[PDB]
Design an enzyme around this catalytic site. Structure first.
Site, PDB file in Angstrom:
ATOM      1  N   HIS A 269      47.004  30.458  36.686  1.00 45.86           N
ATOM      2  CA  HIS A 269      45.910  29.805  36.223  1.00 45.86           C
ATOM      3  C   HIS A 269      46.084  29.543  34.639  1.00 45.86           C
ATOM      4  O   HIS A 269      45.186  28.707  34.272  1.00 45.86           O
ATOM      5  CB  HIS A 269      44.549  30.645  36.552  1.00 45.86           C
ATOM      6  CG  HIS A 269      44.187  31.563  35.421  1.00 45.86           C
ATOM      7  ND1 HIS A 269      44.468  32.912  35.422  1.00 45.86           N
ATOM      8  CD2 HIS A 269      43.407  31.554  34.347  1.00 45.86           C
ATOM      9  CE1 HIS A 269      43.921  33.729  34.283  1.00 45.86           C
ATOM     10  NE2 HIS A 269      43.436  32.794  33.639  1.00 45.86           N
TER      11      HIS A 269
ATOM     12  N   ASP B 233      48.545  35.068  41.156  1.00 42.84           N
ATOM     13  CA  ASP B 233      48.355  34.556  39.913  1.00 42.84           C
ATOM     14  C   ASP B 233      49.412  34.881  38.801  1.00 42.84           C
ATOM     15  O   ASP B 233      49.261  35.722  38.090  1.00 42.84           O
ATOM     16  CB  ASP B 233      46.988  34.930  39.619  1.00 42.84           C
ATOM     17  CG  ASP B 233      46.445  34.215  38.128  1.00 42.84           C
ATOM     18  OD1 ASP B 233      47.148  33.079  37.854  1.00 42.84           O
ATOM     19  OD2 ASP B 233      45.384  34.632  37.586  1.00 42.84           O
TER      20      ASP B 233
ATOM     21  N   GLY C 126      40.410  33.909  27.266  1.00 36.95           N
ATOM     22  CA  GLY C 126      41.622  33.523  26.430  1.00 36.95           C
ATOM     23  C   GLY C 126      42.690  34.728  26.257  1.00 36.95           C
ATOM     24  O   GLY C 126      43.537  34.488  25.754  1.00 36.95           O
TER      25      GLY C 126
ATOM     26  N   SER D  97      43.533  35.581  29.180  1.00 36.95           N
ATOM     27  CA  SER D  97      44.244  35.275  30.538  1.00 36.95           C
ATOM     28  C   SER D  97      45.820  35.233  30.125  1.00 36.95           C
ATOM     29  O   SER D  97      46.343  34.488  29.223  1.00 36.95           O
ATOM     30  CB  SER D  97      43.872  33.789  30.770  1.00 36.95           C
ATOM     31  OG  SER D  97      42.488  33.502  31.485  1.00 36.95           O
ATOM     32  N   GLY D  98      46.471  35.638  31.303  1.00 32.68           N
ATOM     33  CA  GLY D  98      47.992  35.466  31.298  1.00 32.68           C
ATOM     34  C   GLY D  98      48.662  36.534  30.529  1.00 32.68           C
ATOM     35  O   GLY D  98      50.012  36.420  30.572  1.00 32.68           O
TER      36      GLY D  98
HETATM   37  C1  LIG Z   1      40.818  36.368  32.368  1.00 33.63           C
HETATM   38  C2  LIG Z   1      39.642  36.007  32.250  1.00 33.63           C
HETATM   39  N1  LIG Z   1      38.966  34.598  32.081  1.00 33.63           N
HETATM   40  C3  LIG Z   1      37.756  34.648  31.846  1.00 33.63           C
HETATM   41  C4  LIG Z   1      36.877  33.616  31.478  1.00 33.63           C
HETATM   42  C5  LIG Z   1      35.572  33.845  31.532  1.00 33.63           C
HETATM   43  C6  LIG Z   1      35.099  35.122  31.689  1.00 33.63           C
HETATM   44  C7  LIG Z   1      35.998  35.906  32.227  1.00 33.63           C
HETATM   45  C8  LIG Z   1      36.946  35.968  32.486  1.00 33.63           C
HETATM   46  C9  LIG Z   1      38.377  36.747  32.542  1.00 33.63           C
HETATM   47  C10 LIG Z   1      38.311  38.155  33.033  1.00 33.63           C
HETATM   48  C11 LIG Z   1      38.340  39.129  31.743  1.00 33.63           C
HETATM   49  N2  LIG Z   1      38.565  40.616  32.317  1.00 33.63           N
END
Ligand SMILES: Cc1[nH]c2ccccc2c1CCN
Ligand SMILES: [Ca+2]
Length: 223
Positions: free
Chosen positions: A40, A84, A175, A177-178
């Site tokens: 993603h 993912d 943020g 993410s990844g």
């Molecule tokens: C990876 C990711 N990106 C988001 C963007 C908005 C809300 C929650 C998340 C999450 C999960 C966090 N545990």
């Protein structure tokens, strides 16, 4: 990272920032030429930033290297977030040292209860928004498959696991993410998704890296 702590500069030497004019995702350095991140996080024009602590200041240990190729997993589904995971090849090899170092891939999957380290430059608030400059860390246990599925009915596949705290307050966030989930010195997870951040009964969900080791190795071997 909500409810975490300041890691300390370059103490997470496999953590990378993916930059497209700004930080937009984390990733993990797995050899001198390759980074693993979340599918993603895919976009064009990625510069991989290694050796970072403060992402807004050049502090002297960074290496900035553009991506030559990105490979999203063949079976990634962006609606369900199944599979993912993505690989990014660097245009040149990173110079490895104590502050820029690869993280080992798992030889076996990790069990519920295992302690892990989750890190990133994501939002530090569960309500509201504040983005840090320096790398944040969170120690968190892997949760049982049954508790993960109970938290997210109908959504947890065999390529996902939950980690964190059902009571809320401590989680990865936007943020992050990844980025990495490292347990006992092995990359077991990738920050993937969740319902909000740090909410009660809604732990973070992570890509189960051990399922992808053969794909990672064969992809590297031919690319
Ligand atoms: C990876 C990711 N990106 C988001 C963007 C908005 C809300 C929650 C998340 C999450 C999960 C966090 N545990
Ligand atoms: Ca920096």
């Amino acid at each position: 990272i909500v409810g975490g702590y300041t890691c300390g500069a370059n103490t997470v030497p496999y953590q990378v920032s993916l930059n497209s004019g700004y930080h937009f995702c984390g990733g993990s350095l797995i050899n001198s030429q390759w980074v693993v991140s979340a599918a993603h996080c895919y976009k064009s024009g990625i510069q991989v930033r290694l050796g970072e602590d403060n992402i807004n200041v050049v502090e002297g240990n960074e290496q900035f290297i553009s991506a030559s190729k990105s490979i999203v997993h063949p079976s990634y589904n962006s609606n369900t977030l199944n599979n993912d995971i993505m690989l990014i090849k660097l245009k040149s090899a990173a110079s490895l040292n104590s502050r820029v170092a690869s993280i080992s891939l798992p030889t076996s999957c990790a069990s519920a209860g295992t302690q892990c380290l989750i890190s990133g430059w994501g939002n530090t608030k569960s309500s509201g928004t504040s983005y840090p400059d320096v790398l944040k860390c969170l120690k968190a246990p892997i949760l049982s498959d049954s508790s993960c599925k109970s938290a997210y009915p109908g959504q947890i596949t065999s390529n996902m696991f939950c980690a964190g705290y059902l009571e809320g307050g401590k989680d990865s966030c936007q943020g992050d993410s990844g980025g990495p989930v490292v347990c006992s010195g092995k990359l077991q997870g990738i920050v993937s998704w969740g319902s909000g951040c740090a909410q009660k009964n809604k732990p973070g969900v992570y890509t189960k890296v051990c399922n992808y080791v053969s794909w990672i190795k064969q992809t590297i071997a031919s690319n």
